Design a binder for this molecule. Structure first.
Ligand SMILES: Nc1ncnc2c1ncn2[C@H]1C[C@H](O)[C@@H](COP(=O)(O)OP(=O)(O)OP(=O)(O)O)O1
Ligand SMILES: [Mn+2]
Ligand SMILES: [Mn+2]
Ligand SMILES: [Mn+2]
Length: 903
DNA sequence: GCGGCTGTCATAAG
DNA sequence: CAGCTTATGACAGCCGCG
């Protein structure tokens, strides 16, 4: 019933828009848009547009954009502010969509597709499309069909049709196990020559031209390659047919490293899933191949064939095509789980931007603020070139390296965005400055009150209070979105810890999984049905609850990402509202607030426990505080609480009814001190962490800033049935750690925290012995392969050459000659192993592409020349030393006098 | 050759 | 190629040390 855009795009002086009309049909437009911009003019003229400061502005309507832009560059040339939205696309969308956009995902065509290409030349360069495409699979979100385009004959041998029968069969029957969920959704069409396969696919693209285009590396491989294949075969003219408006630009991506090339398809918003996943997943991965991610997200089987990829088509065409089909399915499966494409749409439409602009926070917020001002008949200021100036950030406490038994943690709900709201920080809301005392003076309240009338930050900034700024206004609106999606995540998690509590003492029946929406706290009625439901169906509920929670993560964490990104924007030379005055006012106030509540909390409990001077808060990072409950429990005497929960219950009920009220008036004082607009410092209890009851076990430890581990029972209302290890900063959290060692180290920590000195030493003994028998992959270090060229001197290590680059250069030397082996790529990640003295390679180490197994051309020897001793001390012992040094423990009993004894 | 030390890098925590 | 700062540890190259 309401119209919304699908794409927008500016070519010369026409605007091209794909949109869905008021009925539901996809259409196109070609509009000669008349843009507007503004300039300062005096008071005597009757006007109705002001800039954000409230100065009057006059509006200029240009016939075309060619004019509208030329104006801008003659305006800066003279040096007078050319006000208004200069990104004509956005201004346009705002004009056409003077309302909140209530889009419908079922009318938006989302496609994803995988290309296969055979190449004995090694990797097929998408710029050169040297070889022929012999498989395309294209899923359409509206037809809900995998359209398979199979090539039969090519200069690399001819083959027979693919069979949906054999495909759907079991791997155990020789079939390919193509999921049945989709077997009836497959549209298969074989081709005799490439040119036919190609022309029919181009025609098909016309009939089902995609809005969102996706897949895995489709922006760096599948698109450029297919575009360039067609270029060289049909001429560029037909090649441009790939964009519903017939315009393509070779967009250059440059780093501080090099310069790759991508192709732009005007009229299609390309969201590559590898760029989606790297942005929104909040997980750093050792490898970003589809297999590795699939095994990770979907716990599916490592898609296994036989021989190399290059020969697969000749040798086994039936796996070839299925393995291309399944490839596409699992991208839709990771999206089913993660729901990134959804989020992208949610965010783009909220801002009224191009959908591919979600990757840019600066763009996003620029358009959010813009659309906000337009509504109030206000004019945005001009863009400006600023020198990059580094400024101060958050404050991290210096924690005494030590074990810590009973611990409880608190955290500020969106500290930075709250501070914008609390103090009223916005570009136009600025009131003036005052003589600033040292920051420590404001923490203790010793220094004088900043201003009686304005709202103040301890960096010497004053802000209005009667006026609502734009940034606080707009940040509140997106905060709320998080606050609520955060509510459905924690509830979906809460529900987890019933279903898990159920799986302890289950039932057996032939019941089906119960129908309830997991976004809300399970009620009394539902919970008791759970105590009788079968383990099979119960399992199929935890899965669903977990899938809802992951959907919870996605919407919340990424909106949290947006709000904080508004702060980062206030510090970005390219951001329209960049103003260090503002950004520092945020970070600084943030330091005061933290240290303030430390002092204060060190004052509340000391007066409560009787003690005079004790240091209760052991650590704090930006907004969080960690409190040592030892004196508290000791005050009541641990010889009370019957079980582990009884003292956990105790401390939650403690934090709730006693602590946060005392904090509440603590933070209230500071608001009054700083005469802020409204009080929005909210500290909520997160982790309740201790050791199990009646067991030798340390509970937790700090080894220094940003490196600590706790053993947690309750994490933000959500109460775990099994203790959950909360490890921040340590080697178990680093992607560069070998997978087997990550596992090893976490078990050491678990035992340390849960089972004491005894248990650890025992596991250390055992791990050491069964270390040499581990998978080589599971013990490799990982790392990014950057500036390979910078340090490559004739295929040999240059000066200051890092250890993993050395690894890489060794690889290249050893593989130099025959091309068929995997090449390492500038940018991607590599597995690194250390080699023993006098190995047949040049060096003391070897690297190769992560994910993959190393080539048989070199595998046999590597395994033989692996340096286990160095690898174990490098990756496992050294980091472990740290933990124990910190907790004041020994991972290995020191020798003594008693050792002189017969067992 | 070993041991601080600063610097490039990779990757974490906010 | 896509907001911000703060902070760690692995490692290479430099420098003092009978
Ligand atoms: N990715 C980021 N980009 C910019 N600033 C950040 C980022 N992460 C954290 N910060 C800053 C802003 C945060 O308010 C502050 C502490 O963040 P953190 O406690 O991790 O989340 P948060 O306080 O924004 O909300 P919440 O505590 O509800 O998760 O540090
Ligand atoms: Mn594939
Ligand atoms: Mn926080
Ligand atoms: Mn925090």
């Amino acid at each position: 019933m309401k119209e919304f855009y699908l794409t927008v795009e500016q070519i010369g002086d026409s605007i091209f828009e794909r949109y869905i009309d008021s009925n539901g049909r996809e259409r196109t437009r070609e509009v000669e848009y008349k843009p507007s911009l503004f300039a300062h003019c005096p008071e005597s003229q009757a006007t109705k547009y002001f800039d954000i400061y409230g100065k009057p502005c006059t509006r200029k309507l240009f016939a075309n954009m060619r004019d509208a832009s030329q104006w801008i560059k003659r305006m800066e040339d003279i040096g007078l502010e050319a006000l208004g939205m200069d990104d004509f696309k956005l201004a346009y969308l705002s004009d056409t969509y003077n309302y909140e956009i209530k889009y419908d995902h079922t009318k938006i065509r989302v496609a994803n597709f995988d290309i296969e290409v055979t190449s004995p030349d090694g990797f097929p360069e998408p710029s050169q499309a040297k070889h022929p495409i012999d498989a395309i699979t294209h899923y359409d979100s509206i037809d809900d069909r995998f359209y398979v385009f199979d090539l039969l004959n090519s200069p690399y041998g001819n083959v027979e049709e693919w069979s949906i029968e054999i495909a759907a069969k079991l791997q155990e029957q020789g079939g390919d196990e193509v999921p049945s969920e989709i077997i009836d959704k497959i549209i298969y069409m074989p081709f005799d020559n490439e040119k036919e396969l190609l022309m029919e696919y181009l025609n098909f693209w016309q009939q089902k031209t995609p809005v969102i285009l996706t897949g895995w590396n489709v922006e760096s491989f599948a698109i450029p390659y297919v575009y360039n294949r067609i270029k060289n075969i049909f001429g560029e003219s037909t090649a441009k047919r790939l964009s519903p408006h017939r315009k393509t630009r070779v967009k250059v991506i440059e780093n501080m490293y090099g310069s790759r090339e991508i192709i732009t398809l005007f009229g299609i918003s390309v969201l590559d899933y590898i760029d989606l996943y790297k942005k929104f997943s909040f997980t750093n991965q050792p490898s970003y191949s589809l297999d590795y991610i699939s095994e990770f997200e979907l716990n599916v089987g490592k898609l296994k064939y036989d021989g190399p990829i290059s020969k697969l088509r000749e040798s086994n065409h039936q796996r070839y095509i299925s393995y291309n089909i399944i490839a596409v399915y699992r991208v839709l499966q990771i999206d089913a789980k993660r729901q990134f494409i959804n989020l992208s749409l949610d965010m783009g439409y909220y801002a009224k931007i191009q959908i591919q602009s979600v990757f840019s926070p600066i763009k996003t917020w620029d358009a959010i603020i813009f659309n906000s001002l337009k509504e109030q008949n206000k004019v945005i200021p001009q863009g400006r070139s600023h020198p990059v100036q580094p400024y101060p950030g958050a404050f991290v406490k210096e924690p005494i390296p030590n074990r810590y038994k009973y611990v409880m943690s608190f955290d500020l709900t969106s500290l930075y965005p709250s501070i914008i709201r609390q103090v009223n920080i916005s570009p136009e809301t600025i009131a003036g400055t005052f003589k600033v005392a040292p920051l420590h003076d404001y923490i203790n309240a010793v220094a004088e009150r900043p201003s009686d009338v304005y709202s103040c930050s301890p960096n010497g900034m004053m802000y209005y209070k009667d006026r609502d700024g734009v940034v606080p206004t707009e940040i509140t609106k997106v905060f709320n979105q998080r606050k609520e999606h955060k509510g459905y995540m924690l509830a979906a998690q809460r529900n987890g810890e019933i279903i898990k509590e159920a799986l302890h003492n289950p039932n057996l029946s032939v019941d089906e999984p119960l129908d309830v929406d997991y976004r809300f706290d399970f009620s009394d009625e539902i919970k008791e049905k759970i105590k009788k439901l079968s383990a099979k169906s119960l399992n199929e509920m935890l899965f669903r609850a977990q899938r809802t929670e992951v959907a919870g993560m996605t919407a919340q964490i990424n909106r949290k990402a947006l709000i904080n990104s508004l702060y980062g924007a206030l510090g970005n030379v390219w951001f329209r509202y960049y103003d260090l005055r503002n950004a520092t006012a945020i970070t600084t106030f943030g330091q005061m607030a933290l240290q303030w509540i430390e002092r204060k909390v060190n004052e509340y409990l000391n007066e409560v426990c009787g003690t005079e001077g004790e240091a209760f808060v052991l650590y704090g990072d930006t907004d969080s505080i960690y409190v040592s409950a030892d004196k508290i429990i000791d005050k009541v005497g641990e010889s009370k609480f019957r079980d582990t929960n009884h003292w956990v219950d105790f401390l939650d009920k403690f934090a709730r009814e006693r602590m946060e009220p005392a904090i509440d008036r603590g933070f209230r004082e500071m608001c009054e001190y700083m005469n802020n607009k409204q009080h929005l410092m909210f500290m909520d209890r997160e982790a309740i962490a201790g050791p199990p009851l009646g067991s030798k076990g340390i509970g937790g430890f700090w080894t220094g800033k940003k490196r600590y581990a706790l053993n947690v029972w309750d994490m933000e209302g959500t109460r775990y049935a099994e203790p959950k290890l909360k490890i921040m900063g340590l080697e178990t959290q680093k992607s560069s750690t070998p997978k087997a060692v990550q596992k090893a180290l976490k078990e050491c920590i678990r035992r340390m925290l849960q089972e004491g000195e005894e248990s650890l030493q025992e596991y250390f003994k055992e791990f050491e012995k069964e270390f040499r028998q581990l998978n080589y992959i599971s013990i490799a270090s990982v790392s990014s392969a950057n500036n390979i060229a910078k340090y490559d001197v004739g295929g040999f290590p240059g000066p200051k050459c890092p250890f993993h680059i050395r690894g890489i250069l060794t690889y290249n030397r050893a593989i130099k000659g025959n091309i068929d082996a995997p090449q390492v790529v500038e940018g991607e990640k590599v597995y690194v192993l250390p080699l023993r003295e006098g190995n047949p390679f040049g060096d003391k180490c070897i690297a190769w592409p992560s994910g993959t197994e190393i080539t048989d051309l070199i595998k046999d020897d590597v395994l033989h020349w692996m340096d286990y001793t160095v690898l174990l001390e490098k990756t496992f012992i050294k980091p472990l030393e740290g933990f124990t040094s910190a907790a004041k423990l020994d991972y290995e009993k020191k020798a003594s006098l008693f050792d002189m004894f017969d067992f």
